[PDB]
Symmetry: C2
Subunit: 287 residues, 2 copies
Amino acid sequence: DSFWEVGNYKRTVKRIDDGHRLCGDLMNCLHERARIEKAYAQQLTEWARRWRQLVEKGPQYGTVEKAWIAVMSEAERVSELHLEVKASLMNEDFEKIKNWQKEAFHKQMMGGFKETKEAEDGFRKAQKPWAKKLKEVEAAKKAHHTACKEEKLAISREANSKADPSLNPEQLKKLQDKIEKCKQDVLKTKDKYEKSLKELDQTTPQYMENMEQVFEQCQQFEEKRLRFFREVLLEVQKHLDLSNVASYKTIYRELEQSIKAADAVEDLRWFRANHGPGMAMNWPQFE
Amino acid sequence: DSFWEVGNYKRTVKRIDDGHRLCGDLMNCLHERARIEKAYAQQLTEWARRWRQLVEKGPQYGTVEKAWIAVMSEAERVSELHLEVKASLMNEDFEKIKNWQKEAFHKQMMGGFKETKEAEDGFRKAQKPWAKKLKEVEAAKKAHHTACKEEKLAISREANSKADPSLNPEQLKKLQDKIEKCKQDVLKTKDKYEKSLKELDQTTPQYMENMEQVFEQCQQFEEKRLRFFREVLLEVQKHLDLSNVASYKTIYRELEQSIKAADAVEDLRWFRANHGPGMAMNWPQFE
Ligand SMILES: [Ca+2]
Ligand SMILES: [Ca+2]
Ligand SMILES: [Cl-]
Ligand SMILES: [Cl-]
């Protein structure tokens, strides 16, 4: 069926509540992910703390130890970034939505929202006249299609004397009497039936305005929401994007640094002077 | 105290068994790293399957819907990357260390490594001659400082003769013989104490030389593990680095462009003509 048909704006008004619903959704969606971003960061700092300790108590000293611990550090510094994502999603994006939802929706006392009950009210009194003066027409339709069908009944019960030569005098008098009263009956109904249509076609213009006038407002409101989503999702896109960052490559430019700084020659060197033949020795002498 | 003191070559030998353990530690270190990269991916893909349904089943249609879902996609393509890390870590870095750690370590039929019992036996082979040559000197020490101190007591037997005209020169002869007997036990022992040292010096150049080769043979083997750790870690750093990854930057340049394609006007135009004043209508007529 059509929107212009009485009470079919229902699905345009329903979009309002759906709008409020789509806010909470976009919030939970962001939040639920923000929680995952922290889950990763937390697992990294925990892991780092674990091995930064295991390596410490480990038997592996020297420059290699530093090169090793450099990875525990990268894990931490990565956690710092991902731990920043979380906040960037909640403190900014999430809230920026929560606020928009309140400054756009107002919970009516009874139920639903103000801007929802208003659209309904608006559409109603913007369709009322075209609906009421649609009853005059419809009440005239079943008033004419009842008389116009009543005419054929007279035309039928008029030739009922083609077999029975009964009271012919009183017959052709009454038969041609009812078909005449029915002639004006169908004509007077059509006359008042054409009127109702005029009375409606005159209500149409004003009805075409008030409706679209109430509808246009909804579109504008929905626009503010759509354009708002494109605005938030973009920010979110930048809060997830770590490729377009400089501090990221840094973490992996310095990791390569520390690892390369592992001079094996220098390690064996140290070990040679502290545990190897490089140690002093009181060679046995006369006492 | 010093490495050159007999037996004090354990620290440099214990280094061997440590080298093995260390490998096992670094393997667990990487395994736990990837195991987290996996859990992080699993959480992402499931976050996608989670909301990719809620959005498609939700009241959010049109371009804005696509822009929204566009996020789920980035959440998947990212998860896919961290899964490449898990594999790279376990299939290469890990399987590499494990492989190396077995090709350089062979457990005995008794326990311990063939290379552990390799250096120890080697050290003893080069130190035994020096040790046994020293055990003689050590005995000569409790040989000269046993007759030389035995000499000092011989003077006591004479010093005690200051106010005791006891025996005759007959006894003086008994203490007079110790002049050409006790003194000999000091000049003959000190003479041999010389030999023990002189002869030991003939067994120290060959001693250090030999003791050196063994130690260097450890420096060689140890070097291999060190340089290996460097080679490995370098690769590991590269398997964790998503900075210089072509696919990574693309993910977001693609997400962003997808969100910018979210035309608000596009969605609006559609609704008005599908549920609004745009819909056609059978304006009442004569029947
Ligand atoms: Ca250590
Ligand atoms: Ca949908
Ligand atoms: Cl409220
Ligand atoms: Cl209220």
